[PDB]
Amino acid sequence: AAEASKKPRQKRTATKAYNVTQAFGRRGPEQTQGNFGDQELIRQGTDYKHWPQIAQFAPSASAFFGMSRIGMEVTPSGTWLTYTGAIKLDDKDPNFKDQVILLNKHIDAYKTFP
Amino acid sequence: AAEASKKPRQKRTATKAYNVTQAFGRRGPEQTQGNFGDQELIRQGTDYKHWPQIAQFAPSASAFFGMSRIGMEVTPSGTWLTYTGAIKLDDKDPNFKDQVILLNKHIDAYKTFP
Structure with a gap:
């Protein structure tokens, strides 16, 4: 659009x-x-x-800026806000195994197709 | 709460x-x-x-999973969904210089806490 x-x-x-x-x-x-x-x-x-089961792991704006390591880099292409972090899956959720399966299905999936 | x-x-x-x-x-x-x-x-x-001026840089759930490098790390401490990325600021935005000042005021600010 x-x-x-x-x-x-x-x-x-x-x-x-x-x-x-x-x-x-x-x-x-x-x-x-x-x-x-x-x-x-x-x-x-x-x-x-199955987007809802993926989106349950996305951070709120508050948590994005609260959990992550944030930086700023000025380079020839512009000014960039860099971010890194990690979100723990709940091992006690009965759905834990399905959550790992679903996330792993998408991580690096592109390697298997053009 | x-x-x-x-x-x-x-x-x-x-x-x-x-x-x-x-x-x-x-x-x-x-x-x-x-x-x-x-x-x-x-x-x-x-x-x-000034929260809105910071939150404008936090990603939507779609962008979080669309822009980031996502990984799954299984460690003794648990199972972690890792993420890393970079978000470009818009130089042509009239508030750009204010955005840089604001981000610089918060990144690693804790180093100066008493």
Whole structure:
């Protein structure tokens, strides 16, 4: 969508009409390039039927800035806010095994298709 | 606030009633610690007067999983969804210089705490 693309990258919401590749670029291995999503998620974004079970791990704005290591880098391409962190899965959730399966299905999935 | 602390860490929202330290731990230099926030933001969370100007850089759930390098690390301490990335600021934005000042006021601010 033309209107979906107008938002800053970090505020975009991928959907079937404006998919993960369109919003966030092709998946790949490079440092600041996204590696998450199998072909179905890539094509569907938040319309993906199991998106809620993925989104339960995304941080709120408060937690993004509260949990992460934040930095600022000024480079020839511009000024970038860098972030790193980790979110613990709840080993006592009965759904833990399915959550690991679902996340692993999408991490680096792009390696198996063009 | 009782409901606030019950949420998984990544879904917590810091406020003046449940602050950044309570929700996300003390700021510090270790890889597992957050480093972001001066004393005012830490105390106020999302009630901080300039919170919207910071939150504009936090990612949507779709962008979190679309832009980031995502990994799964199984360690003795548990199973962790790791994330790393970078968000470009818009140089042409008229508030750019204010955004740089604000971020610089919070990144590693804890180093100067008494």
